[PDB]
Design a protein around this ligand. Structure first.
Ligand code: NAG
Ligand code: NAG
Ligand code: NAG
Ligand code: NAG
Ligand code: NAG
Ligand code: NAG
Ligand code: NAG
Lengths: 325, 159, 325, 159, 325, 159
C-alpha cells in the first residue's frame, strides 16, 4: 500500500507573466482588461445623443440656415460633432470666447429654443432684408442665421435709436447671441446704417457691453470683406437684458433656455455612426460591453467604464503552474 | 518554485485530479484513484478570490480625460492638459502592469507553499509506517484499507 | 521532563487585512491614518489668522464702508472668509482679475494702509461729492469706498485733464485700486463729467492702462443703473505710477504696502470659529494633532500635515497572527 | 501560514509568553515556565521597525490642493485643476491601500517563517537525543536540568 | 569522505537596502540611476542649437539692432537663452501674449527672414525717420527694430490712410509683428501723425485687429515716456493680411517663414557652454551619457533621457547576501 | 534569511566557489574542490535577468516638464503647472524607491530559498547512507569516488 501528495493539472494553454519569468502556463487565470469595442454611438441612460451632422457647434447654436434640421428643442446624453462638418460660422467673423462656450454647452443636457426678441422690437428699421449669399440655406440663395437678425436702416431715413428688453422671469438661464457688424469701408457703412458715430450696447445685472464698428477692408471670406464680431452670454434667472443700438447691431432673435446637467457631459469629435442601441459605457472609439476592470480602447468616455490603460493584456493567475504529464 | 514543491520533487501535477487544486492519489487492496484535499484547496480559493476582489476594488477609480478645446493662444494650458492626462495614464499603466507581474509570482509561490505544507502534514503523522520516497509519495509497511485511507486525509490517523 | 517551541498571543482584538484574507486579528499593529479633527481655527507659528467677518475679500480690500472694522494694518498666517459675507462690492460692477487678486492676497502676510493720492492731487474737480446710497456706512446711508474717491466735475465748469504721480521709493510692493465709472446714458455722463470723449489712463515702467466709459442702459442693481469697472495692480519697489484722466475716473486714494510670503498662504472659506489656540497643522476642516503619516480630514491645509488620503483606515500589522486558546 | 508553522502544525499561541514574539515552554521537575527567544524576536522587531519606518518616510510627501477660484469663463482650467487634484488623490489612495495590504501579508509570512526556522534550529541541535511529536514539541531520552534547558536555547547543546 | 552544500561570496563592497534591513552587502548588484553630467550643450539629432548670446528671444525676433549677429535665417534643435542677455525690447512697451509667443517659437525648428511689407507699401508717409536713441545699434546711437518700421507723417502732408496687403501663397505659416505707438502727450501725437482720431486695423481670414492710441504721460524708460504695444500673429498658408492705418502704426517690415518641428521643442535658460559635441539626451544642466533607467540631474530635457527622479541612488540587488569567511 | 539557509545553518559563503551562485564542496581520496550547480544557478540568473529587464521596461516612460513661462496675472495656472510637475515627480520617486526596497528583499529571499531547495534535493537523494551534520554538509556512508561525487550532482546516483 501507498498514498500520494500532489497537485492539479489540465489542458490549459493560457499563460501569464511574472517578475522572474515570462510565458508561464497555469491551470486557471482571469483577464482584467477589455480590448473589444463596438465602433458606434449608442444611447446612454436610454437617452439618445445629439448628432450635429454636417454642422459644427457654432453652426448649430447660431442657427446656420444649413442646419435647420437641428433647429428647436434638443435633448442629449452627449454630443457628437463630426470632424469635417462644413456648416459653422458662414458670415465671416470671430465668435468671442468660443472654447468656453463649447465647454458650457457640453455641460448641458437640454435646450428650449424660443423667440427672445421679435423683429417688432426694433422700431423704424428694416428687419427683413438683412440677408446674404454668404449664408445660403442651399448654395445660391441669400439668408442669415435663424437666431440672429441683421438690422438695416429702412430705405431712406436714418437708423434711429432702437431698444429691446427681455426680463427673464423664468427659472432657467438663457443662452443668447449678438454681434457687431464691421463693414469694409465708409460707403458700405453709410448705405447700411447711414452716417454718424454708431454703437451696439447691451446691459444686464451682471454684464456690460458697448462697442463701435471698426471699419476696415479684409480679405473676402464667402464673398464678404465685412466681418461680424459674435458674442454670447447667459441671462440668468431673474436678470433682465437691455439692448440699445443706433447701427451695426446683429440683434438676438431666438435664444435657448438651458438646462445644466450637474456634470459629466461630453462632446465627441468622431466619424462613428449613431445606431439604435443602448450602452452603460460609451467611448469616443465605441461602446464597451464588459465586466472587466481595465480597458485600452479610450480615455475619453461617458457613462461607467473600466479604467483606461495602455496595456495590451492584464491577465492574473488564480490557479497553479501547469505541469501536465 | 521557492518552496520546492510544484515542478520540483513532485515533478508534475495530475490531469486526473479534476477535483480541485491540491489532493491525493491512493493505491491499495480496493484499487486506486484521485481525490482532492478541498479544505486546503478552497481555503486557497477563498484567499485568491480575495486577492482578485481586493485588486479590482483598489482599481475601482477612473481618471477622466476631457473633450476640451484650446485656442491658438492657449497652447501652454493645452499642452498642460495633455501632459497631465498622459502623466496619469502612465502611472496607472505602470501600477497595473507591475502589480500583475508581482502578484502572479506571489500567487505561484502561494500554491507552491500549499502543496509543500500538505506534504508535511501527511509525513508528520506517518512517522515510520510509511517510507517517504522523496517523490511526494509514501510507502506503507503495514496496510491501508479506505477507512485507513481517509483517516490519513481526515487528519484521523492514530498509531 | 521536556521542552517546546511556540509564539505569542494576547487579549488584543485589533484586526488587519491582507491581499489573501480580510479581518485578521493580530497581537500588535499600528494606525497610520488620523481621522480625528478639532473643528476650529487656531494660530500658525504663533500668528493669528484674519477673520473677515461678514465682509468678503473684495469688500475688505476696497474699503467697503461697512468693513471699517478691518480697516488699517493687518497681519495673518492665513485668511478666513465667511460663506455668508454680505459686504463686498457695494456699488455694482466687476472687479477685473478677481481670482488672480485673491491668489495674490493669499500669498500675503501683512498689509499697511496708507494714503497714496490725497484728494488735493486732482485739480479742478470736485472730490467731496462721490457718494451713493448703494454704499452706506452704519453712519450715513450714502457713502463710498474708503480706498477710492469718486471724482465729479466742479458744479459749474467742465472736467479738466487731471494728473497724479506716486514714486514708490519704498522697499515694499504696493497693492492699489482704481476704477472706471460707466453711466447708463449720455445725460448722466454729461451731468457728471461733461461733454466730449473721456478716458482713464495709467502708466508705470512695466504697465500701461487705458479705458473709456462704456455707457449702456442697464437694469438697476442696488438701485444703481451705472456700473464701475474695478481694477487692481501692484506698484513694485522703484517703480512710479502716473495717472491721467479727463473723466469717469474712480481714483485711487488709499492703498496697501504688501508683504508677500515665500510660503504656503491660505484662504479658507469656512464657518468654523477662530479660537485662541495654537497649531502646527491647520486644515479647512479643522486642526490636526498627530504623529501619523496619513489623514482623511482635508486636502486643503496650512502648516505641516499628513498626506491626505481617502481611506478610512491604514492599519499596519507589526505583531503576529493572534491564536489564543 | 505559507511556512506552515503559525496556525499550522503549531496550531496555537501562548497567552503565557509575555515578553517576546517567539520562545519556549520547558518543563523539567525543577519546574516549569515560559521564556522567549530574545535574539530572533529582537531581529524580527528590528526588521519590522525598519519596514514601518521605511514606509512612513517614503510616504513623507504631500500633494497640496489649493483654494484658488475660477471665473465663469475659466470653466476649463477650473475643471483641469479639479481633475488634477482628484487624480493625485486617487493614486496616493491606491498606493497606500495597496501597499498596506501587500506588506501586511508579507509581515505575517515573515513571522510564520521565523517560527518555523526556530523550530528547525532546535530539531537539529536535538535529533535523536530527542524524538519529535510533530506539533513542534521536543522529546528527550536523557535528563534535562535547566542548564540543560539553557543548553538548548543558549545554542550550546552538547550532543 | 564528504560533500557540502553552499553559496557564493566575493570581495564585493556594494550594499543595498530592503524593507527589513539597511546596509546589506551583496555579491552582485546594479545601479539604475545616473547622477553624472557633462556640463555643456551639444548637438541633437546632429543639429546644433541656437545661442542667443546677449539677446533675449524678444530682442532676437523683433530684430533689436544690437542683435544683428542673429539676423536672418536660423535652424536649431533647441534654443539657449542666457540668464541676463541685455538686448530685448529696447523701446519701452509690452509684447502682447509674450508667453504664448515664446512657447510657439520653442515649438519651432527653423525661421526664414523675408521682407513682408517694403517701405514703398505705405504711400504718402515718411518711412525713413522712424528711429530713436532708445534703440541704438553698434554703429548709430539712434536706430530701430529691423523687422518693424515706425511711420511718421511726411516732411510734408498730414497722415493719410495707408494700406498694405500680403497674400501668403507659400506652404509655411508666417510669424510676424506690428505695433501701436502711444505718445506721452497731444503735441507729440500731432507732430508725428497730425491731428484727428487715429486707428490701427488689421485683418486676415481668421483674425481681425483694431486699436487706437492711448495718449498719456508715463515714467521714463530708456528716455522714452512714450510706449509701444507690440503684437504678433501667424499668417497661415493661404491666408492674406490687410493692414490699414491713419496714424500710430508700427508697421510690419520683415517677418519669418516658420517651420514647426512636431516634436518636443525646448528653450533652455542657462549659462553653460555650447561645444562641438553630439548627444541623444540633453538636459538644462548638461548632457547625459547612459544606458541607465533613472537620473536625478534635471526634469527639463530634449532627446531621449532616463526618467527623472529625486533619489540619490537606486541600487537593485541581483546577487546574494555576502558572507565571506 | 526567512528560509533559514543563507546566514543560517549554512552560516557563511564560499569565496572559493567562483563558478556560480550555488554549489558544492566535495572531499574524497582523490582530492577536494569547489564546483557550482550550473542548472539552479542558471535558472536564478535567468529569472533575475528577467526581473531587472521587466523593471527597466515598465519604467520606460517619462513625465515631461516644460520650460513654459507665466505672466504676473497667470499665478494660478503657473502654480497648477508646478503642482502637477512636482506631483508626478513625487509619485515616480516613491514608485522607484519603494519598488527597489521591496524587490531587494524578495531577491534575497529568492536566493535563500534556492540554497535551501538544493540542500534538500541532495538531502533527499541520500538520507541514511550518510547523515547530515546540520551544517548543510554530509559525511558519508562509503567512500565516494568522484563521479560517485557528481553522481549526486547528476541527480542520478542510485542508492
Ligand atoms: C513569450 O511567448 C510568445 C508566444 O506567443 C513569444 O512570441 C515571445 O517571444 C515569448 N517571450 C519571450 C520574452 O521570449
Ligand atoms: C422683471 O419682472 C418682475 C415682475 O414680473 C419685476 O419685479 C422686476 O422688477 C422686473 N425687472 C425689470 C428690470 O423690469
Ligand atoms: C491669393 O493668391 C491666390 C493665387 O495664388 C488667389 O487665388 C487669391 O484670390 C489671393 N487672395 C487674395 C485675398 O488676394
Ligand atoms: C473521518 O472520515 C470518516 C469516514 O469513515 C467519518 O466517519 C469521520 O467522522 C471522519 N472523522 C473526522 C474527525 O473528520
Ligand atoms: C470584518 O469585521 C467587521 C466587524 O468587526 C465586519 O463588519 C466585516 O464584514 C468583516 N469583514 C468581512 C469581509 O466580513
Ligand atoms: C549605512 O552605511 C553608511 C556607510 O556608507 C553609513 O554612513 C550610514 O549611516 C549607515 N546607515 C545605517 C542606517 O546603518
Ligand atoms: C523717483 O525718485 C527717485 C529719487 O527719489 C528718482 O531717482 C527717480 O528717477 C524717480 N522716478 C520718477 C519716475 O520720477
Amino acid at each position: 500500500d501507498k498514498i500520494c501528495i500532489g497537485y492539479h493539472a489540465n489542458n490549459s494553454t493560457t499563460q501569464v507573466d511574472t517578475l522572474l519569468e515570462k510565458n508561464v502556463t497555469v491551470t486557471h487565470s482571469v483577464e482584467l482588461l477589455e480590448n473589444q469595442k463596438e465602433k458606434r454611438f449608442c444611447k446612454i441612460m436610454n437617452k439618445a445623443p445629439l448628432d450635429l451632422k454636417d454642422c459644427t457647434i457654432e453652426g448649430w447654436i447660431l442657427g446656420n440656415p444649413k442646419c435647420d434640421l437641428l433647429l428647436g428643442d434638443q435633448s442629449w446624453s452627449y454630443i457628437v460633432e463630426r470632424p469635417n462638418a462644413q456648416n459653422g460660422i458662414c458670415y465671416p467673423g470671430v465668435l468671442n470666447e468660443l472654447e468656453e462656450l463649447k465647454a458650457f454647452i457640453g455641460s448641458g443636457e437640454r435646450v428650449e429654443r424660443f423667440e427672445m426678441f421679435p423683429k417688432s422690437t426694433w422700431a423704424g428699421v428694416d428687419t427683413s432684408r438683412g440677408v446674404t449669399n454668404a449664408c445660403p440655406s442651399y448654395t445660391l440663395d441669400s439668408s442669415f442665421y435663424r437666431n440672429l437678425v441683421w438690422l438695416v436702416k429702412t430705405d431712406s431715413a436714418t437708423y434711429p435709436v432702437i431698444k429691446g428688453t427681455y426680463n427673464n422671469t423664468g427659472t432657467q438661464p438663457i443662452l443668447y447671441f449678438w454681434g457687431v457688424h464691421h463693414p469694409p469701408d465708409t460707403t458700405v457703412q453709410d448705405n447700411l446704417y447711414g452716417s454718424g458715430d454708431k454703437y451696439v450696447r447691451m446691459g444686464t445685472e451682471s454684464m456690460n457691453f458697448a462697442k463701435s464698428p471698426e471699419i476696415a477692408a479684409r480679405p473676402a471670406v464667402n464673398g464678404q470683406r465685412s466681418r461680424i464680431d459674435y458674442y454670447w452670454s447667459v441671462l440668468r434667472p431673474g436678470e433682465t437684458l437691455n439692448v440699445e443700438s443706433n447701427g451695426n447691431l446683429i440683434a438676438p432673435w431666438y435664444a435657448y433656455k438651458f438646462v445644466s446637467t450637474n456634470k459629466k457631459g461630453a462632446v465627441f469629435k468622431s466619424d462613428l455612426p449613431i445606431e439604435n442601441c443602448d450602452a452603460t459605457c460609451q467611448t469616443i472609439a465605441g461602446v464597451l460591453k464588459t465586466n472587466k476592470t481595465f480597458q485600452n480602447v479610450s480615455p475619453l468616455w461617458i457613462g461607467e467604464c473600466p479604467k483606461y490603460v495602455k496595456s495590451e493584456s492584464l491577465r492574473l493567475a488564480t490557479g497553479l503552474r501547469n505541469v501536465p504529464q | 518554485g521557492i518552496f520546492g514543491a510544484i515542478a520540483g520533487f513532485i515533478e508534475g501535477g495530475w490531469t486526473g485530479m479534476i477535483d480541485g487544486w491540491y489532493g491525493y492519489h491512493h493505491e491499495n487492496s480496493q484499487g486506486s484513484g484521485y481525490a482532492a484535499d478541498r479544505e486546503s484547496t478552497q481555503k486557497a480559493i477563498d484567499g485568491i478570490t480575495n486577492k482578485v476582489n481586493s485588486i479590482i476594488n483598489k482599481m475601482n477609480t477612473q481618471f477622466e480625460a476631457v473633450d476640451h478645446e484650446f485656442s491658438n493662444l492657449e497652447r501652454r494650458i493645452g499642452n498642460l492638459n495633455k501632459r497631465m492626462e498622459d502623466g496619469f495614464l502612465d502611472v496607472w499603466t505602470y501600477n497595473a502592469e507591475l502589480l500583475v507581474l508581482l502578484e502572479n509570482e506571489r500567487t505561484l509561490d502561494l500554491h507552491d507553499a500549499n502543496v509543500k505544507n500538505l506534504y508535511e502534514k501527511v509525513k508528520s503523522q506517518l512517522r515510520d509506517n510509511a517510507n517517504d520516497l522523496g517523490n511526494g509519495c509514501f510507502e506503507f509497511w503495514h496496510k491501508c484499507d479506505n477507512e485507513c485511507m481517509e483517516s490519513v486525509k481526515n487528519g484521523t490517523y492514530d498509531y
